[PDB]
DNA sequence: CGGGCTCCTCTAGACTCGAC
DNA sequence: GTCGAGTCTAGAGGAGCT
């Protein structure tokens, strides 16, 4: 299955138990390995880049991961209290004062971004529309789950608010179906706020069900207003030369719920990440003697690798010698791009042995040609 | 035991002087000991008692011969007899014809009559003519040799030339190298050379096979001065040019053959091609090679019996073929302490470029409204400039601006028809600046004026210099210095009115070689003292200059030396080569490295016949603020050996003030000079050295180098020159000089030397060159003469050390062998059951030389404060001092913790004598 | 001007004046760092990844949780977790979870699973960076390496890694004098040094280097040693856990000190922006579609630009250039009139301020040779 | 007249070769 | 054709040793 493939490969991590579909959905542990939080950081890279390097007017936010607290009853995230104040005490009071001034745990990146509103606000002169993009861990209650949410708060003129949403909606499903093997698993649908005002959810059939991974609501200028309960002109945007409250659409997703996806979306029992998101994209082995001189071959062609950005696994510096075959089994469930094996015939003209995942199909090729032709499939897969 | 002369100087042991001189002898008589009291008691020695030392007892090996001088003799006749048997084959020896074609095979060729190439696996010849060719872009490794033996002609093809292959492994080994090795005896042009790439000659224990040098011949015979090479170079009294020639062997050979002048490739494939090209032009450099293997052989056939003639005692050729088997062992850590040197280099050259290419940036804003004409530091430079040369939307919308936008820019990079062919380098930045910086196309490039350093000559304006409160200012007539504005109220190195600078005076820096010499950096070592005492400082203040400084002198050594020491050809042993001693020794290390580096040694590289080498006689020692400076340490001895060895305590002192003592009477001391010499200690702080280091106040380095340089022609201008430095007088120069006086003897013997119509060492009486006799210069080069005598002197001590070395380690079965000799120190690599029969043998061979100077010379005794070493130290690193530790800044944890090399000890002769039992057998 | 306040004006700070404070900056009780400053921190966070990671062999990447179990230690002073519906006090010191103040205890949890990876061979690396929280509550992001060295050769790869992460943090730095090291122990004499820079107050301990032994990786694994012993050459030895921690939030307000006419000389590896585009006179559609191109040229192949053509607030050359170099910007690419007749862009450089021509064609990779060349 | 060497970097200069 | 960029080569000063 999926769940022992990715745990014995470090994509997946935890305890047996904590392996359940409501564990990991729940996330109240590490439910990503080494290989797993490289294949996150890859698609966390690929949003940021997406929705934030080749968009107009997107701009980084970060915020705390704690809140100031309101003791709103709706507010059933966990609270920060100090150890050294329920030391003093050892009961109604107590309580009262922990209610009412203990921050709690962020539930959602929407607030930050409307803190951080003002300065964005001032550093695009006031200019609407703009984005403001956030990429942070969010605190639920199952002990306590976290997500790491991907979300992008976009604000917008009253005017073509819906307009936006469905060019938002069309955009993610397109972003989603990029990276897809099965482009089909990923739909959209409609939906309605709670307070009557409409959204979007973006699905992946999961093979339990369609687990929502992100989702788009029209939430207007409300939330705007509490975050902001002074002066209009400070809360106002400029839309061409007017000036009006920009409507707040919310757009977040989950890449923890993603990186799942992509997971049982790709998937012998090879992987077949997409080349913009695969954790390990070279793999560095060695045949027979010479050892001394192919590890010092291996080290040079390692080191030209990693100074243009080419994620590479020493193989060769293992000690444990198995069959070829073995080794590109392991590869491909680790979703190695490409195997380059170095050999005695290296030494006398350059030619190295190239396996590419995808075809299974074996090449050579010259020392001085690999980077640059992996540097071009690459570049390849990312444009296209 | 205890004997004491008619000067009362405590002379040899009675036992000692028995076996040494033997019974008997003659006195000097009445009259020299009237001579030498009346002497010692005007310069006030006579007075002064004498503490005895404790008396010596040794059963010396018995010297062979009627006296010294026959044992001597004998023992260099037995060590050079089958190497001359061998150097007299190729003069008499007649070559076949040169083959038409050379061989492209792998191996050793043998050429016979009429060109028949057959391939052997060795020359096997007692004598042999050689050269090596290397090619340098493959490294340091043997590309191609040829080599001339009786009735044959020899070519050897590397297989990185017959084989073609992407790439071969970096670390040598002695498959790598020639195979060319009871006695043999091996002939180059610079054989050291010829030496260090033979697989052969790194094996840890020693060989028989000896190089002779045909230019170590030459500058022995008819050698030539560095002031004199300049001259003959540029014509190229003056009648020694037609009897001395440059060390390069088509000069040799126009001389001491003067056929038809030897030809060279024009395009020096090997040093400026790369192996494609040598495997392309393969014939004519083989032809070329050929060639220079038959010039030298006939420059050694009329070399041979001219050297003979002109150096006739045994003893000097039996230490010029000792001399040239020099051998450094070291291990794993040499590759260690490379990398951390040239790490550590590079965070201090970036850490210094740093500052200097941000005081570059901050320099090129001045540019804007001219105000480069304001600064007092960079007004003078190129502030040029060059012009350039010349010869929401939807979806579908959205995907069309894209494609429009795309086409527009492609567009544009189609016009490169206006461009010119070659890229105008950085035309918008100032003309000093574009030299800084390499260009664009460089394989090498590296953002902002990577190429600036301290060494260049707008640095010490970058960082705005200041002497004393004064800008400096580069004159290329006078080197460094300073404008004094208001044009003659400072005083210095005077106002040189040539520069001519608008309204300022250019006064030198103060140098430490006098107002003679010109000022060529700042940054120099002499000016940290005066950067620290505030005369020297920097625009920006704070310790950036300084630490500038201090930065200099850490890298200083390694700048000049890191490609020397980097490339230094170390041949790694496999575990099958190194000894069975070094495998089984508890501290073998099994995964470790271990090999050796034979120094390139050309043994009488000068014409006081010193050997000379590029590195290993230059390496600095080891020190707490050098980079690099741990290089001799790193001449680590293998598991199971020592490097025990002793220094000469006031060699040339010592020689000068025996020759003086001999040429007034018989005995030792005869002289207030040989009196001041003998009664002294270093362990005591009395000795020659320290004894003028106290009266002036400076170190015991620096007393050696004021004693030489008075001895050996300081004349007034260096008498008065120390003065002035030392007090802020030529009076005092003359009254210095004339203390008949202390040292009249010494240099009447050492004129009536040189003056001689054929100037000969006092001891082996070898000749001095043709180039310097009085035949041929007419009083000319007198300071080189004269010097000549005891710097020569110490060659023939070195000579005799040597030789009698080598029969103490061979008569008695010492397992050590020669490992390096500077100038007047002998390291031996010593098994550690022989470490302190080493000991012995050295204390005993410097008794033995001493008593042969002092009987060649007629004394016919030795005193017993120069019998022995002061110390001979038992070490398992090449170092100074065996209880130094390095902590040098590429080092900072020592010897002791990073490479794990414990301290040694220093024994004198009691402590050696208690532990042998005074005996050298087991 | 002082150094806060260009940092607020040029948006790589955050937060009210009196969170620009000294004492509210080294705090991390609020979000300090604007827009710039995250795409700073995010570079200097990249170059410490590469440095400690890509390039070192056997360090891992390891990513653990905010919150600690929730065990009743007396000495921990860190903030509890309370779920609010649960009280609408004995047991909350007893059993509620704790924000984690070090991301040792990841490491140590994480630790059987890496030693899996490396087929337990001795030595490795976790590495991490994340956000621990400390009692002050403030939020520090702790980029922390923790080396299992084995016993053998605890002190060599402790110097070595001083000697590395000093060397590190003087690279990115103008004054590589102002970072130095100085050696410290701990309340229990644990052996260790402290890296620092000397900020204009005093020095600050950036990263702290201590040499723990056995016992704190016992600490997590109260079992067998079977299971912990790793594999050191031939002989199984428990390894010796050094935690070679630095504080990337306080690195990044050192370099803001250390960079800083009024330019931050941020290193060229860890600026924010790097390439910013202008416009020409007129005609401003050919011009703008021309920047549009080149931007996208630009963008895709890893170069961070700032399009300032879009901008529609008139500004003198002046006025451009001063705000491009206090927000670091490395290079300013102008394109006029005269680009669309023979492809000719005028180019300035922070570092410099020399204005020069290129053609169009070769400006991606001039822009790619010298960022590559750059981080060397 | 301190000697006797070794090598390095830096810079001025003459020479060669290509480009418009 | 004339200009301008590469390319050795010579000398000078500094830095090691003895
Ligand atoms: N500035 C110098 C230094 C040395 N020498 C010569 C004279 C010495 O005999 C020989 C060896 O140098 P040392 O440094 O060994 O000088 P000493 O032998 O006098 O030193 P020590 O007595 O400590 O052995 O080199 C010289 O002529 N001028
Ligand atoms: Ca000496």
């Known amino acids: 299955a999926l769940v022992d493939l990715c745990r014995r490969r470090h994509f997946f991590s935890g305890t047996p138990q904590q392996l359940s579909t409501a564990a990991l959905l729940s996330g109240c542990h590490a439910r990503f390995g080494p290989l797993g939080v490289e294949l996150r950081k890859n698609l966390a890279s690929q949003w940021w880049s997406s929705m934030v390097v080749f968009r107009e007017q997107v701009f980084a936010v970060d915020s705390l991961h704690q809140e100031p607290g309101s003791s709103q009853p709706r507010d059933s995230a966990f609270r920060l209290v100090s150890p050294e104040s329920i030391r003093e005490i050892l009961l109604v009071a107590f309580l009262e004062n922990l209610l009412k001034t203990s921050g709690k745990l962020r539930a959602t990146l929407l607030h930050g971004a409307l803190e951080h509103y003002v300065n964005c606000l001032d550093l695009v002169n006031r200019k609407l529309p703009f984005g403001l993009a956030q990429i942070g861990v969010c605190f639920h209650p199952v002990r306590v789950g976290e997500k790491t949410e991907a979300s992008l708060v976009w604000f917008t003129p009253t005017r073509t608010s819906s307009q936006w949403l469905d060019f938002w909606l069309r955009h993610r499903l397109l972003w989603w179906r990029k990276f897809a093997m099965s482009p089909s698993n990923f739909s959209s649908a409609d939906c309605q706020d709670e307070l009557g005002r409409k959204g979007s959810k973006l699905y992946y059939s999961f093979p339990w069900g369609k687990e929502p991974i992100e989702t788009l609501w029209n939430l207007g200028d409300q939330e705007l207003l509490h975050t902001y309960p002074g002066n209009v002109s400070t809360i106002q945007g400029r839309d061409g030369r007017k000036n009006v409250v920009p409507c707040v659409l919310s757009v977040s997703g989950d890449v923890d719920l993603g990186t799942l996806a992509y997971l049982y979306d790709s998937f012998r029992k090879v992987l077949k990440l997409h080349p913009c998101l695969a954790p390990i994209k070279v793999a560095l082995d060695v045949g027979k003697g010479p050892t001394v001189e192919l590890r010092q071959v291996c080290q040079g062609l390692l080191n030209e690798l990693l100074e243009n950005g080419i994620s590479v696994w020493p193989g060769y510096s293992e000690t444990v010698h198995s069959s070829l075959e073995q080794l590109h089994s392991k590869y491909d469930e680790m979703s190695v791009l490409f195997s380059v094996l170095v050999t005695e015939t290296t030494l006398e003209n350059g030619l190295i042995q190239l396996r590419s995942r995808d075809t299974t199909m074996k090449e050579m090729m010259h020392i001085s040609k690999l980077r640059d032709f992996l540097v071009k499939y690459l570049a390849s897969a990312s444009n296209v | ?922």
Not at chain 2, 645 to 652: C, K, N, P, T
Not at chain 2, 750 to 764: C, G, K, M
Not at chain 2, 782 to 800: C, E, F, G, I
């Open chain 2, 1 to 922: 035991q205890l004997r004491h002369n008619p000067l009362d100087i405590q002379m040899l042991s009675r036992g000692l002087h028995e076996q040494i001189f033997g019974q008997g002898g003659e006195m000097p008589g009445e009259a020299a000991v009237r001579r030498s009291v009346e002497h010692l008691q005007k310069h006030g020695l006579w007075g002064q008692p004498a503490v005895p030392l404790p008396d010596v007892e040794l059963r010396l090996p018995p010297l062979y011969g009627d006296n010294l001088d026959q044992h001597f003799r004998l023992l260099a006749q037995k060590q050079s007899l089958p190497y001359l048997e061998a150097a007299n084959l190729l003069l008499q020896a007649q070559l076949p014809p040169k083959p038409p074609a050379w061989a492209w095979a792998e191996g050793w060729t043998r050429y016979g009559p009429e060109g028949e190439a057959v391939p052997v696996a060795i020359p096997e010849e007692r004598a042999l003519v050689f050269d090596v060719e290397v090619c340098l872009a493959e490294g340091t490794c043997p590309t191609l040799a040829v080599a001339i033996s009786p009735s044959a002609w020899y070519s050897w093809c590397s297989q990185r030339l017959v084989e073609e292959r992407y790439s071969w492994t970096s670390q040598l080994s002695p498959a790598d190298l020639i195979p060319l090795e009871q006695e043999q005896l091996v002939v180059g042009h610079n054989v050291s050379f010829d030496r260090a790439h033979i697989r052969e000659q790194y094996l840890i224990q020693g060989s028989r096979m000896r190089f002779l040098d045909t230019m170590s011949m030459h500058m022995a015979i008819s050698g030539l001065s560095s002031f004199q090479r300049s001259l003959w170079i540029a014509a190229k009294s003056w009648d020694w040019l037609d009897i001395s020639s440059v060390n390069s062997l088509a000069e040799v050979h126009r001389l001491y053959v003067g056929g038809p002048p030897l030809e060279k490739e024009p395009r020096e494939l090997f040093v400026k091609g790369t192996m494609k090209d040598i495997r392309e032009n393969f014939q004519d450099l083989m032809q070329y090679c050929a060639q220079d293997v038959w010039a030298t052989h006939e420059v050694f056939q009329q070399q041979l019996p001219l050297f003979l003639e002109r150096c006739p005692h045994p003893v000097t050729l039996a230490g010029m073929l000792e001399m040239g088997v020099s051998y450094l062992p070291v291990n794993q850590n040499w590759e260690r302490y490379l990398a951390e040197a040239q790490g550590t280099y590079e965070e201090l050259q970036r850490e210094m470029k740093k500052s200097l290419m941000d005081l570059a940036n901050d320099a090129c804003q001045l540019l804007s409204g001219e105000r480069y004409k304001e600064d007092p530091w960079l007004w003078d430079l190129e502030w040029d400039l060059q012009e350039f040369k010349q010869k929401p939307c939807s979806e579908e919308e959205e995907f069309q601006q894209d494609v429009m936008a795309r086409a527009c820019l492609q567009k544009l990079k189609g016009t490169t028809e206006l461009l010119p062919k070659r890229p105008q380098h950085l035309p918008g930045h100032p003309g000093w600046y574009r030299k800084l910086c390499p260009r664009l196309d460089d394989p090498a490039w590296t953002p902002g004026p990577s190429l600036l350093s301290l060494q260049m000559r707008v640095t010490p304006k970058l960082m705005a210099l200041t002497w004393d409160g004064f800008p400096l200012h580069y004159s290329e007539r006078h080197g460094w210095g300073y404008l004094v504005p208001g044009r003659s109220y400072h005083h210095g190195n005077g106002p040189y009115n040539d520069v001519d600078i608008p309204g300022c005076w250019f006064f030198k820096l103060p140098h430490k070689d006098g107002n003679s010499c010109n000022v060529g950096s700042p940054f120099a070592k002499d000016f940290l003292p005066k950067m620290e005492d505030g005369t020297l400082q920097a625009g920006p203040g704070g310790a950036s200059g300084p630490r500038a400084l201090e930065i200099n002198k850490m890298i200083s050594f390694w700048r000049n030396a890191h490609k020397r020491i980097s490339s230094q050809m170390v041949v790694w042993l496999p575990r099958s080569a190194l000894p069975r001693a070094v495998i089984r020794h508890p501290d073998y290390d099994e995964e470790g490295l271990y090999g050796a580096i034979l120094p390139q040694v050309v043994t009488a590289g000068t014409i006081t016949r010193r050997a000379v080498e590029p590195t290993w006689l230059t390496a600095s020692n080891a020190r707490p603020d050098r980079v690099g400076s741990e290089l001799k340490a790193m001449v680590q001895a293998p598991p199971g050996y020592t490097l025990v060895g002793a220094d000469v305590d006031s060699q040339e002192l010592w020689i000068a003030a025996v020759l003086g003592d001999a040429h007034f009477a018989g005995m030792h001391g005869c002289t207030a000079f040989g009196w001041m010499t003998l009664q002294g200690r270093k362990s005591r702080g009395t000795d020659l050295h320290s004894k003028t280091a106290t009266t002036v106040g400076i170190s015991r380095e620096h007393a050696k180098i004021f004693n030489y340089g008075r001895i050996y022609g300081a004349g007034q201008p260096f008498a008065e020159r120390l003065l002035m430095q030392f007090n802020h007088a030529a009076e005092k120069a003359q009254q210095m000089y004339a203390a008949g006086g202390t040292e009249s003897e010494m240099f009447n013997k050492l004129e009536s030397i040189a003056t001689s119509d054929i100037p000969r060492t006092p001891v082996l009486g070898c000749c001095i060159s043709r180039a310097l006799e009085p035949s041929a210069v007419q009083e000319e080069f007198m300071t080189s003469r004269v010097n000549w005598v005891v710097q020569s002197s110490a060659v023939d001590y070195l000579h005799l050390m040597l030789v009698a070395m080598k029969w103490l380690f061979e008569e008695f079965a010492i397992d050590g062998r020669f490992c390096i000799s500077i100038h007047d120190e002998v390291r031996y690599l010593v098994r550690e059951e022989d470490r302190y029969r080493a000991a012995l043998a050295l204390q005993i061979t410097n008794l033995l030389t001493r008593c042969m100077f002092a009987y060649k010379l007629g004394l016919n005794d030795l005193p017993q404060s120069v019998a022995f070493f002061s110390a001979v130290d038992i070490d398992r690193c090449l170092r100074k001092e065996v209880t130094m530790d390095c902590k040098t800044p590429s080092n900072p944890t020592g010897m002791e913790r990073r490479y794990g090399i414990p301290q040694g000890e220093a024994l004198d002769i009691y402590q050696i004598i208690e532990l042998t039992k005074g005996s050298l057998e087991k």
